[PDB]
Amino acid sequence: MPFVNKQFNYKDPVNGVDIAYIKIPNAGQMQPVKAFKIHNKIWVIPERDTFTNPEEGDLNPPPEAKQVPVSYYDSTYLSTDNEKDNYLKGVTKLFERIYSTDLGRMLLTSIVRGIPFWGGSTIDTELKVIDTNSINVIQPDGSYRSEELNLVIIGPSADIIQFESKSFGHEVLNLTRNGYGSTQYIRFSPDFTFGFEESLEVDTNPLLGAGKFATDPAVTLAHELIHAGHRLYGIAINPNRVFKVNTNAYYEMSGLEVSFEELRTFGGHDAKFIDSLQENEFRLYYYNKFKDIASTLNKAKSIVGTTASLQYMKNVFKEKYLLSEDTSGKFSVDKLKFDKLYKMLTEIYTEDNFVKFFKVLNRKTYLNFDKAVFKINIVPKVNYTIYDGFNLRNTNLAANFNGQNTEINNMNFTKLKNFTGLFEF
Ligand SMILES: [Zn+2]
């Protein structure tokens, strides 16, 4: 069964249900943008993100510096209807490629179940929604209705290749780290990809290689979806917790620090740089958060709003958090169940495991150096498919990851920028 029932076209008429002009409630003032609901709880906005961050409201290139050195600017990308149509089709195709794998079906199911907690009440006896976990949808009569959602895929902001799962903050609460969760906005483009090097000694050296192989963008989207899963379950690791990398002399020359949240998300050997003591600390911390959620639930005796029953919403959260329910109706956290869900979200859903399901070549570690950015077009089936990505069966591209080989499959990649040697190491 496909993940996305509808093969939307960008110019399909609005209907106020799954094709609609919307606003993001605390982006602040914005004009409505056309958006597409591709699955329960999941929307796609084919626009550059000038909305989620007040200080990132324009796309022009210039010299705030060339920092991060890995960056790419084009203020015109994703400004036309044809681009937006292709964006919507590309994103859809990547969701289908992900969903076609058992691991991706598991991850997307977890994401859909991961409704942001109704932790907005100032009154313990009432359960209430946090309104930054919604969008405002223009209805056919021109009025707005509030719709809760879990995930939005949106185009990148000024730096086209800066992909990220981000979310609106709360005055008091760290929603992504307190077990609550919050609606995630993933800046992403299917229209570009990264180069990497097939030899580890080259890929992890900042001075070598031009980016012979292209990352499959399904892996890149999966990576961001894994962050969104952490953040929807409120178990993201504070970016302040960093591996002050000491396993790569070039990282060390520039004092490069990599978050534990990134090492977790990559998985494989990288995750082992989070030591067992610190893993246990995080596991304890988050277990404690789930406990607070159970207590909050138990204290609630009425629901606020007319959307759903209080039993419906307690069941939603009992299912999300896999809570136990006692004879009196008290919720509790079962330690075996917590450890299993935590482990599913953090050890099973990893970039390294997706590479195994997609059978693609990929970076072997997050602790490498980016080589290049390429323009791509995955929408034509002659270029890329749900089942094979670039490595099309029964062609010269089927074997040896030849489809990802940008030299062999050169028609599918246009190098836009080299990053090798730009680095200060
Ligand atoms: Zn990441």
Side-chain angles (χ1 to χ4, degrees):
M1 194 103 263
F3 195 67
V4 185
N5 184 226
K6 284 190 178 157
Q7 305 322 304
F8 292 126
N9 307 295
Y10 184 69
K11 302 302 286 178
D12 285 348
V14 289
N15 59 37
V17 177
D18 56 348
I19 308 173
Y21 290 104
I22 70 173
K23 312 254 260 62
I24 296 152
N26 78 138
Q29 298 306 322
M30 59 176 287
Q31 293 300 107
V33 292
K34 197 172 182 178
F36 301 77
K37 188 177 182 178
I38 59 165
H39 189 96
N40 185 34
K41 304 303 177 185
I42 303 176
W43 290 74
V44 180
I45 300 174
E47 300 287 341
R48 300 285 293 279
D49 180 14
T50 57
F51 313 104
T52 66
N53 186 342
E55 296 310 301
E56 293 180 347
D58 94 301
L59 310 177
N60 282 324
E64 341 187 317
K66 328 291 213 200
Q67 13 187 352
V68 52
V70 173
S71 64
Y72 179 69
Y73 297 87
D74 167 17
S75 59
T76 72
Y77 163 65
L78 202 55
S79 61
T80 66
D81 290 348
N82 192 41
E83 292 173 283
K84 292 176 191 181
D85 188 64
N86 207 57
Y87 180 98
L88 184 57
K89 293 174 163 53
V91 170
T92 294
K93 189 170 204 170
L94 297 179
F95 269 98
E96 298 297 356
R97 177 147 169 73
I98 295 162
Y99 195 65
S100 73
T101 68
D102 287 334
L103 185 62
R105 175 188 61 67
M106 294 159 66
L107 172 59
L108 288 165
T109 300
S110 293
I111 286 172
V112 174
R113 293 180 171 157
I115 302 295
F117 182 61
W118 280 34
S121 177
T122 27
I123 304 169
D124 350 76
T125 173
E126 302 185 345
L127 198 74
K128 183 191 178 188
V129 78
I130 293 183
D131 61 9
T132 57
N133 293 325
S134 59
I135 55 171
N136 293 328
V137 180
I138 299 182
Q139 306 174 103
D141 71 344
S143 71
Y144 285 91
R145 58 178 173 86
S146 179
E147 179 170 326
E148 280 178 71
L149 73 178
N150 296 359
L151 177 61
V152 173
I153 307 306
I154 191 169
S157 192
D159 181 6
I160 286 171
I161 63 180
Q162 179 272 316
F163 299 163
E164 178 193 359
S165 185
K166 64 213 312 296
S167 53
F168 297 98
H170 183 103
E171 183 108 48
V172 191
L173 263 11
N174 296 318
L175 295 177
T176 70
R177 310 198 291 274
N178 76 348
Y180 281 26
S182 53
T183 298
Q184 298 300 306
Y185 289 76
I186 294 179
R187 290 173 172 175
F188 175 79
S189 174
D191 297 311
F192 302 85
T193 197
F194 303 93
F196 67 96
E197 288 288 318
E198 66 278 7
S199 295
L200 188 66
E201 285 204 285
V202 175
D203 203 43
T204 63
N205 191 290
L207 300 179
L208 296 175
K212 179 175 176 167
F213 283 89
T215 299
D216 184 325
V219 174
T220 308
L221 179 57
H223 175 112
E224 300 305 327
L225 293 168
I226 292 162
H227 290 302
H230 304 156
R231 293 168 68 92
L232 279 164
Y233 289 76
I235 62 170
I237 309 174
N238 190 323
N240 75 12
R241 309 293 290 264
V242 290
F243 176 28
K244 290 171 190 72
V245 179
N246 70 335
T247 50
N248 180 304
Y250 298 101
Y251 272 56
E252 293 190 303
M253 290 181 51
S254 304
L256 296 184
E257 298 179 355
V258 171
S259 80
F260 285 180
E261 172 62 25
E262 295 292 351
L263 297 170
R264 167 203 269 184
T265 293
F266 185 83
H269 184 259
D270 283 13
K272 297 185 159 141
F273 291 119
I274 316 177
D275 52 297
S276 175
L277 241 62
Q278 221 147 168
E279 322 178 332
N280 294 342
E281 167 199 344
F282 298 151
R283 183 188 288 108
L284 180 60
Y285 183 94
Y286 299 122
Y287 164 65
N288 297 335
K289 302 304 169 148
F290 279 31
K291 284 193 299 178
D292 285 349
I293 292 169
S295 175
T296 291
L297 286 163
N298 289 335
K299 289 179 289 187
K301 276 96 201 341
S302 66
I303 198 99
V304 180
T306 44
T307 190
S309 75
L310 175 63
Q311 64 270 202
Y312 180 85
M313 292 313 301
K314 284 195 177 191
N315 191 250
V316 169
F317 296 119
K318 100 102 144 203
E319 301 175 81
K320 175 181 178 184
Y321 300 105
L322 298 181
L323 303 178
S324 296
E325 196 172 346
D326 85 9
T327 41
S328 57
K330 226 179 124 71
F331 289 135
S332 60
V333 178
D334 178 282
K335 168 105 156 42
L336 276 185
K337 292 203 294 200
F338 171 79
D339 285 357
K340 293 208 313 97
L341 180 52
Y342 182 79
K343 167 181 161 173
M344 182 67 61
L345 290 160
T346 65
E347 301 178 32
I348 299 303
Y349 305 159
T350 66
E351 177 174 338
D352 195 63
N353 281 339
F354 274 102
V355 170
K356 300 181 180 192
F357 279 81
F358 288 135
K359 303 163 286 187
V360 291
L361 198 65
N362 194 81
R363 63 189 176 189
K364 297 296 194 281
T365 179
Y366 193 84
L367 302 181
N368 67 355
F369 285 96
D370 289 312
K371 307 296 180 189
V373 53
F374 297 96
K375 189 72 185 62
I376 62 176
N377 182 10
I378 68 169
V379 172
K381 288 174 185 307
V382 290
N383 294 357
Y384 183 101
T385 65
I386 293 172
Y387 274 79
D388 291 334
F390 290 112
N391 295 322
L392 302 178
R393 61 186 74 220
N394 296 316
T395 74
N396 65 323
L397 304 183
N400 304 315
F401 316 106
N402 280 346
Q404 295 173 263
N405 183 323
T406 67
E407 297 170 13
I408 296 181
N409 192 13
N410 56 90
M411 297 280 78
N412 270 288
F413 305 93
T414 297
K415 189 178 292 182
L416 301 177
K417 186 175 178 182
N418 275 309
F419 304 128
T420 297
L422 291 189
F423 298 103
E424 65 128 289
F425 353 39

